[model samples]
Target: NSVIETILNHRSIRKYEDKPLSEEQIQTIVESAQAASTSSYIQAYSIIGVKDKETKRKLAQLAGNQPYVETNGHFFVFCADFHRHDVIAEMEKKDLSTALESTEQFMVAIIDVALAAQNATLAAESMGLGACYIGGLRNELEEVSKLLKLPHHVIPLFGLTVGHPAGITDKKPRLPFKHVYHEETYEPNDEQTKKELTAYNEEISAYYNERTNGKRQDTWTGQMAEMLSNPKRMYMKEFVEKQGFNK
Candidate 1:
């Protein structure tokens, strides 16, 4: 129950008190990130800590004008990086062309970066800090990469905004385990699963309505449908392709 209680208390904190983290705290948090396992020991990732107000403001504008991004005491941008490998190959006078474009290489880099970022987030939380992941960094992928001066074989996967929490809120609920997990053979969702999902959708709808004073859409299905019907879905696909993934 205590473990569940700790997890249940987790929520995305967008706003923060204007305070700076000590150098020791920063080292501890980054060490936690570096301690995560890597695929094949490639360690294909890098993180940039943006502390300058001007840079943070530019990042905030790039990430859909999310003001909290600029205000957060610590802003971290995580990237899937293959540039280090390329640099090593160049130093050794070796050809890296054969492996750089492989889908397998891309997967390894992205997964390794994500795992390290999660470790950093959990470590920050353990030390009484609140954090939120900003996937919207992908919205302007090219500009972000250029701003950070990323080279070929490197891509910004996401951004993280971390600081102390100013308030608490209810924990958002997840779908029933049965709806997500499958037994052996991976059976498709049947009538019972559909019924369970329908009920869960209702629960989510009520939750949203209650939280937003009826100003937001209350139905999960409607919200999903609206998103799908919008034109923004495929905007990032072109950006990712330009970054040399799935070529």
Candidate 2:
């Protein structure tokens, strides 16, 4: 029940207090992440904690100048790491290139990173800390890989910024439970989907309007359509291949 309460209260924190997280807190947070279930017990992931001011500043810039990236109590970059596995196989005289380069293995690493980061997020939130996932790091994935000195078979997935919140904001409403959930069989009723999304649009529009003093009145569909209007991150395929993944 306490865990569910914490999960329901999650909100992305941007502004943070001046204090930094204690060493013990960082240790607990990361250890909590490590406890997440890994695919096939591979544990194919690594977390890099960035504390250096200048490097953090540069990372913030590379993440689209989000000040919170550098201003957090701690910044952790989650990596999909098969480098260790690669090295082990090489030392054992095993040619694992085909298996390692498979799309399935890449999916395993991605799922591992997501599960671990979520564990870290819940741990931080339970400790009265605030956290935000910085997907913007993917905007300059190549540069970030270079800056972090990542090797082949290791990819910087995303970042997590955690700290004491300067303040908390209202929780964003998600899609309705019934809209997202279905009984055993898949729900393919297009009409039902449209009706639900239309209702959701109204609810989200009101949420934004109230939160912003009516300065903004954007609907969920409007936001989704706008985002989908342009081909964002089209280079991701090439970048992932260059990083020795999903080949």
| Winning model by TM-score | 2
Model 2 per-residue lDDT tens digits across residues 78-97: 99998999898979999888
Off by over 4 Å in 1: 1-5, 213-217, 233-235
Global fold similarity of model 2 (TM-score): 0.98
Clashing pairs in 1: none
Error of 2 at 35 (Å): 0.5
Cα lDDT of all candidates, in order? 0.82, 0.93
lDDT of each residue in 1-247, candidate 1, tens digit only? 8545656667788878778777787778789899999998999998988898888899999999998788866889999888899898889999875676677888888889998998888878877898899988888888889889998878888999888876666777888787778777564648777688689888998898888988764567667787888867376666666666655
